Amino acid sequence: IPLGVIHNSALQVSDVDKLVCRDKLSSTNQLRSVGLNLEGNGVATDVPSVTKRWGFRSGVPPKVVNYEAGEWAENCYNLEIKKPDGSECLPAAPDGIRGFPRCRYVHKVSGTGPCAGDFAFHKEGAFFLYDRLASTVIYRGTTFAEGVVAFLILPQAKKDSTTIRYQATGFGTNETEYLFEVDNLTYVQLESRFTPQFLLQLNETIYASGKRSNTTGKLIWKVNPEIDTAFWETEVIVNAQPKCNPNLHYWTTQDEGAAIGLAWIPYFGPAAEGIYTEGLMHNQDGLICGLRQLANETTQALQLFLRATPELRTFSILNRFAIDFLLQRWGGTCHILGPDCCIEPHDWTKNIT
Amino acid sequence: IPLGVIHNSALQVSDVDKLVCRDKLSSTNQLRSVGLNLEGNGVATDVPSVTKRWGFRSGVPPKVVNYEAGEWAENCYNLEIKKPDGSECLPAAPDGIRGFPRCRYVHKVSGTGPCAGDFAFHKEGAFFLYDRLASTVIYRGTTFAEGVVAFLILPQAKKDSTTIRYQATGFGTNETEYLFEVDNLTYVQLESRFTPQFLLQLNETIYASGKRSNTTGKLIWKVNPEIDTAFWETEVIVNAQPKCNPNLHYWTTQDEGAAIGLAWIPYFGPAAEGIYTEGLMHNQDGLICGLRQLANETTQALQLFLRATPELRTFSILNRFAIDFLLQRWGGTCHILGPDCCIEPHDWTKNIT
Amino acid sequence: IPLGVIHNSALQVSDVDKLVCRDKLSSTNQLRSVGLNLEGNGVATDVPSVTKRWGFRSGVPPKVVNYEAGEWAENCYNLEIKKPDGSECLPAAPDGIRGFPRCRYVHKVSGTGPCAGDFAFHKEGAFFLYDRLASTVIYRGTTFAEGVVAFLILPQAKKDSTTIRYQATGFGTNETEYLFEVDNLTYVQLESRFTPQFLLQLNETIYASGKRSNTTGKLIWKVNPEIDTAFWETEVIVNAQPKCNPNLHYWTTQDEGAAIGLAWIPYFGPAAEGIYTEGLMHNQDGLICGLRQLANETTQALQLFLRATPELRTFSILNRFAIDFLLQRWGGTCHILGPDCCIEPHDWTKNIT
Ligand SMILES: *[C@@H]1O[C@H](CO)[C@@H](O[C@@H]2O[C@H](CO)[C@@H](O)[C@H](O)[C@H]2NC(C)=O)[C@H](O)[C@H]1NC(C)=O
Ligand SMILES: *[C@@H]1O[C@H](CO)[C@@H](O[C@@H]2O[C@H](CO)[C@@H](O)[C@H](O)[C@H]2NC(C)=O)[C@H](O)[C@H]1NC(C)=O
Ligand SMILES: *[C@@H]1O[C@H](CO)[C@@H](O[C@@H]2O[C@H](CO)[C@@H](O)[C@H](O)[C@H]2NC(C)=O)[C@H](O)[C@H]1NC(C)=O
Ligand SMILES: *[C@@H]1O[C@H](CO)[C@@H](O)[C@H](O)[C@H]1NC(C)=O
Ligand SMILES: *[C@@H]1O[C@H](CO)[C@@H](O)[C@H](O)[C@H]1NC(C)=O
Ligand SMILES: *[C@@H]1O[C@H](CO)[C@@H](O)[C@H](O)[C@H]1NC(C)=O
């Protein structure tokens, strides 16, 4: 698992032999795990194109890991897919796995498909980000964000919703048909070019202009091609992605003794949604574009690490880093003045003279 | 999370900047987590007053942590509360969560209430202590003890039931009615002044004097006010609690290779109740009163730490301490003779001379 | 928990006071947990004799630990035992616990017994090895291997199926009757001397010679005593076992970034069975016989460690080792030239002269 460290004002990857003695890890707080969205690299976010990145596969057990800080997503998805015989396709959310906390637009899709498989994975290796838990599968009726997780050592200086409903037929094949749900009886034929802002503006006009359907009669509108329709614009890490959102609007959870006046008490504290801290990080020293690349480059080593462990949810990756960090330099006999012994005796000399 | 360390024969709190080089942590056994009961500070233990410390609240996910050593409790509670429509109020105990192992009096309460909430928390932030697991909620039909957990580094020198049934109506409100269950048809109106020894002595007299009810007819006695009715008497930590039980009768589990003659084998070993070691610690160096205060002062930092993690049961707090302990002193370049480098070279000098 | 370390080309046990400064632990990869089968020591593997090593017991909660590397087993077992009233005896396999990955012969036994107990443990203290998880109980319909787990520090130089069906009556008593299932209606009276190769050769002759039973009529053959019938032949660790299989054909899971050409992606990667690496270790330096003894000598300290923890599945034993390893030498003030300070200053002297 690659580990991000900042040297020469640059984000770099190294763990095994880059024993830079100068690097200081004096607390576990400097260790962070970040879940960056695939949106930041420019992937398409429309429902038709996105669902082609997912597929069902059996014989592979699901794996879950935790991450501390996430990213505000403009798009999220919540699937309620069933088989044509009425059997659900996706498993219910396991205990403690809630939806992604921050989503501008929630694409809730309902429909049918063959579902030739127990679990639905990502065809590109990315994760499904949830509430501080990334999983390799999709859970039924749970809002998720497509993303990947990076791992960082922070320098000691400063260490830190609208629901859109769809209908689907033949989910998960080459021949799928989607319908934008205006209400229970008014539907619009979806296209790959329809943006979220376009679906909502279209929704306001159908409701206001009185173009809703009958009480039972199903009416399916269509939009002709002549109707006109990234989001944020409208070894050294090298970002080789299509685009990069140079700013990171992140979410995390804070802890401190003052607790904003007696709010620790769970009975009086916030709900599952108001526990988060927020911040805006800019691309000073090019960390944001680098970090998005780091999380992509980390995915391959992290997917195999979760394959090999029989643990359902892994929480010990950051602890295992700090242990390895101490074992590399102090795990053997420290030969003073040797390359592998970070002990400095220059202050002492002067007393001998 | 505050960490208790003994300096100048006194229990003290510090972790971040109190790098006392002299302090020796040479094994993980010196790290201990203690669950001290709220009884030790003098809180009232009668069923009517205690149930006002509990309340139902939704939208907050429950959190559980483990502790190694507990405290013998004179009072414990086991709730079997249902809603007036017949729907249970408390969730069933999750896998592996058993009752508190040591209780002199078990207050098993049965009855009804509105239960305006999924889980029932502690209105003061304390935990619900179970079998080496502290939870923030109450489980159905599981004996628990109200307590809090402290964290300690031990010096290297020496590093170490009667069921009372009640009936309730309107559980968890300002207007509740309790009944002391003599048998299935004989009941006594409860008061806040009735002690456990008083309920048992009263029980013996009702049975013996032949004052039991009919075969179906429900009879509810009452005790007039003219009937006369703590338990153990009948930055530096500063105990600011009402009272302090200066002695700690603790329970813990031991491990050693001799195993008392082939008892390790689970098929032949003890049951879930006879695995415990016991001991009696006195207030030498004022550690017991200090420790009860430490566990109270720890509660606030520990409640938020469990809010921020998506882990249902946290077992890694003690490991995370020992990692931080090594990172504070050896996590950077050790400058010999510097304040932050616990390396002593005085023995070597003499050879140079 | 004893820890295996190689000194003077010999496998040795020590952790607490054997602070050999020379020993180097520079990465968590040098830490390994091995699950060795009881076959390697020569225990009988026939179904009748083996089932007498198992027994039911209540009041003892089950415990599970993980191990990294296992051992190819010639014999495994898969029980589907029920009570005479139709109630199952064994609990269903918990989430993520699959069968033992490598088994030459799978003894699938079906039948009835009194099952005077909730869980079935090992009467000798050994574990039930599953897919990188060892448990103290038997799960229903899950293939397991009887084994024990050892713990090792590797030197930095180089750090690394046929189903046989049975029928049973009175399972788990002194009076049990077993039947070798040829098909649903042809059965052979089992004996302790019948080897797996003998049951399969017998199966081929009954099928070929046309000695199968009627369509409903149950026929039970018997083999007279005049019919003639180890497997691999047909403080310092001292192997005091009956036999020792001096070679270890192990299985483990590998992780590396190359991933054999885009196989990390779970949707495209292997199934739950093709994730394993294999290797053959010989008894160079007598490590294999020693290791089998180490895993036996470890069992007693590991069984009590799992009794004391309230954790269902323990994954932190190897991390706890590396933490203790750093705390023993760096957990206190390092007095240069002292016996307990692994710091070498000989290189520096020459500059002073
Ligand atoms: C990380 O970036 C790479 C860039 O190559 C992404 O690779 C894509 O992989 C799929 C199949 O796996 C191809 O069909 C695409 O053409 C590749 N490029 C792009 C731009 O999509 C990869 O999906 C990214 N995410 C990871 C590895 O999790
Ligand atoms: C720790 O001790 C404090 C002492 O102030 C306890 O604080 C009580 O808090 C409740 C409301 O939270 C008040 O109504 C009480 O008057 C306070 N004092 C007492 C003596 O009860 C606190 O409950 C204790 N336990 C913790 C913090 O877990
Ligand atoms: C480890 O080896 C010992 C060798 O003594 C095994 O001990 C057996 O224990 C049972 C009862 O516990 C006795 O009936 C046997 O006679 C003992 N010897 C043999 C050769 O079976 C022990 O079972 C082994 N496994 C462990 C401890 O897990
Ligand atoms: C569409 O508009 C109606 C009323 O204006 C509103 O109730 C509904 O939530 C809207 N749908 C979406 C997807 O915004
Ligand atoms: C009350 O006394 C009876 C008989 O003396 C006994 O069976 C019962 O358990 C007692 N109840 C309590 C709460 O001690
Ligand atoms: C016995 O032989 C038959 C056919 O030869 C085969 O179908 C069956 O699986 C065999 N049984 C075993 C236990 O090998």
CA B174 to chain CA mean position, Å: 26
Chain A contacts in chain B segment 195-224 (CB below 8 A): none
State both tokens at C79: 């029980």
Q: B241: burial class by Cβ within 10 Å (0-12, 13-18, 19+)?
A: middle
The whole-angstrom separation of Cα C91 and Cα C99 is 14
Element at C164 (helix H, strand E): strand C162-169
Burial pattern A169-185, b for ≥16 Cβ within 10 A else e, equals: eebbeeebebbbbbeee
Cβ neighbours of residue C224 closer than 8 Å, sequence gap 6 or more: none
Taking each helix axis from N to C terminus, what angle separates C317-330 and A317-330, rounded to the nearest 10 degrees? 30
CB proximity list for C307: less than 8 A, separation 6 or greater: B253, B255, B264, B266, B269, B275, C63
Which residue in B196, B182, B237, B177 sits closest to B76, CA to CA? B196
Q: What is the dihedral of CA B312, B316, B321, B324, to 10 degrees?
A: -100
Q: Using a CB cutoff of 8 Å and minimum separation of 24, what contacts does C196-204 make?
A: C196/C45, C196/C74, C196/C75, C196/C104, C196/C105, C196/C162, C196/C164, C198/C229, C199/C164, C200/C162, C200/C164
SS3 track for A260-303: HHHCCCCCCCCCCCCCEEEEEECCHHHHHHHHHHHHHHHHHHHH
CB atoms closer than 10 angstroms to residue B5:
20
Distance CA B224, CA B154 (A): 52
Q: Is the dihedral of CA B76, A267, B93, B79 positive or negative?
A: positive
Token pair of A64 as six digits? 């879950």
DSSP code string of C263-313: --STTTS--TTS-EEEEEE--GGGHHHHHHHHHHHHHHHHHHHHHH---SE
What gap in Å lies between CA B304 and CA B315, rounded to an integer? 16
The shortest C-alpha distance from C334 to chain B (Å) reads 5
DSSP state of A259: H
Q: Quick one: CA torsion of A176, A180, A181, A186, rounded to 10 degrees?
A: -100
CA nearest B97: which of B48, B37, B156, B137? B137
How far is C-alpha B296 from the geometric centre of its chain's CA atoms? 11
| Residue C169 backbone dihedrals phi, psi, to 5 degrees | -130, 140
Whole-number Cα distances in Å, C120 to A336, B304, C57, C135: 56, 41, 6, 11
Alpha-carbon span C41 to A224, nearest angstrom: 77
Say whether A323 sits in a helix, a strand or coil: helix
- Nearest protein CA to atom 14 of ligand 5, as residue: B200
Ligand with minimal distance to B163 CA:
5
Under 8 Å CB pairs connecting chains B and C tally to 128
| Residue C269, min C-alpha distance to chain A (Å) | 8
CA dihedral A313, A317, A319, A325 (to 10 degrees): 170
Structure letter (DSSP) for residue C95: T
The answer to whether residues C332 and C340 touch, using CB atoms and an 8 Å cutoff, is yes
Q: Cα–Cα distance between C120 and C91 in angstroms, integer?
A: 10
- Indicate the pairing of strand C162-169 with strand C177-181: antiparallel
Q: Is the CB of C202 under 6 A from ligand 6?
A: no
B319 Cβ contact list (under 8 Å, min separation 6) = A319, B28, C316, C319, C320, C323
Residue by residue, what is the 3-state secondary structure of chain B? CCCEEEECCEEEECCCCCCCCCCCCCCHHHEEEEEEEHHHHCCCCCHHHHHHHEEEECCCCCCEEECCEEECEEEEEEEEEECCCCCECCCCCCCCCCCCCCEEEEEEEEEECCCCCCEEEECCCCEEECCCEEECCCCCCCCEEEEEEEEEECCCCCCCCEEEEEEEECCCCCCCEEEEECCCCEEEECCCCCCHHHHHHHHHHHHHCCCCCCCCCCEEECCCCCCCCCCCCCCECCCCCCCCCCCEEEEEECCCCCHHHHCCCCCCCCCCCCCEEEEEECCHHHHHHHHHHHHHHHHHHHHHHHHHCCCCEECCHHHHHHHHHHHHHHCCCEECCCCCCCEECHHHHHHHC
Question: Running DSSP on this structure, what letter comes out for residue C248?
Answer: E
**Cβ contact A223:A255 at 8 Å:** no
Q: Of A192, A178, A162, A173, whose CA–CA distance to A46 is shortest?
A: A192
Phi/psi class of residue C107: alpha, beta or left (left: φ > 0; alpha: ψ in -120 to 50)? beta
For B:50-89, CB contacts with C below 8 A are 66
**Which residue from C minimizes the CA distance to A308?**
C253
- What resolution in angstrom units was achieved for this structure? 3.5
C162, C206, C207, C212: which to mutate for ligand 6, most atoms within 8 A of CB? C207
Handedness of CA C69, C71, C76, C81 (dihedral sign): negative
Considering only CA atoms, which residue is closest to atom 18 of ligand 3? Answer: C241
Closest CA to C326 of A322, B197, A85: A322
The residue of chain C with its CA nearest to that of A118 is C267
Domain boundaries, chain A: 4-330
Subunits close to B (at least 3 CB pairs below 8 A): A, C
Q: Count A/B contacts: CB-CB distance under 8 Å.
A: 128
Task: Give me A307's structure tokens.
Answer: 């394959």
Q: What CA–CA distance (Å, rounded) separates A128 from A149?
A: 10
Number of Cβ within 10 Å of residue B157's Cβ equals: 6
The helix or strand, by DSSP H or E, that contains position A313, with its residue range, turns out to be strand A313-314
Q: Which two tokens stand for residue A23?
A: 């690097």
Nearest to A316 by CA among C158, B114, B193, B315: B315
Q: Is the CB of A161 under 6 A from ligand 4?
A: no
Question: Of A70, A57, A46, whose CA–CA distance to A136 is shortest?
Answer: A57
Q: Which two tokens stand for residue C273?
A: 């069975």
Q: How many CB atoms lie within 10 A of CB C26?
A: 17
SS3 A99: coil
Q: Whose CA is nearest to atom 7 of ligand 1?
A: A124
Q: Is B125 in the pocket of ligand 2 (CB under 6 A)?
A: yes
Q: Is B96 on the interface with A (CB under 8 A)?
A: no
Residue C53: exposure state from Cβ atoms within 10 A (0-12, 13-18, ≥19): middle
Residue pair C32/C6 in contact (Cβ under 8 Å)? The answer is no
The response to whether residue C186 sits with its C-beta less than 6 Å from ligand 6 reads: no
CA distances from C8 to A95, C5, C23, C236 (A): 51, 10, 12, 10
Interface of B with C in 125-154 (CB under 8 A): 131-133
Closest to A295 measured CA to CA, from A158, A155, A127, A64: A127
Structure token digits, residue A326: 């101490």
Distance CA A331, CA A326 (A): 7
Helix (H/G/I), strand (E/B), else coil: A314? strand
Angle, helices A317-330 vs B317-330, to 10°: value is 30
Is B203 within 8 Å of B164 (Cβ atoms)?
no
Would you give the DSSP letter of residue A328? H
Straight-line distance from the first to the last Cα atom of chain A, in angstroms, rounded to the nearest whole number: 47
Technique that determined the structure: X-ray
**B136/A268 Cα distance (integer angstroms):** 13
Contact B117, B58 (CB under 8 A): yes
Query: What tokens does C21 get?
Result: 């400064």
Query: Would you say A251 and A102 are in contact if contact means Cβ atoms under 8 Å apart?
Result: yes
Q: Which candidate, A283, A47, A294, places its Cα nearest to that of A168?
A: A47
Q: How does DSSP classify residue A187?
A: E
Are the C-beta atoms of residues C255 and A308 closer than 8 Å to each other? Answer: yes
Packing angle of the helix pair B317-330, C317-330 (nearest 10 deg):
30
Answer yes or no: is the C-beta of A197 below 6 A from any ligand 4 atom: no
Chain-centroid distance of CA C247 in Å reads 15
CA A308 to chain B, closest CA, distance in angstroms equals 21
Closest ligand 3 atom to residue C125 Cα is 28
- What gap in Å lies between CA C113 and CA B242, rounded to an integer? 59
Three-state DSSP at A119 gives: strand
Q: Which of A114, A211, A156, A192 is nearest to A30 (CA)?
A: A156
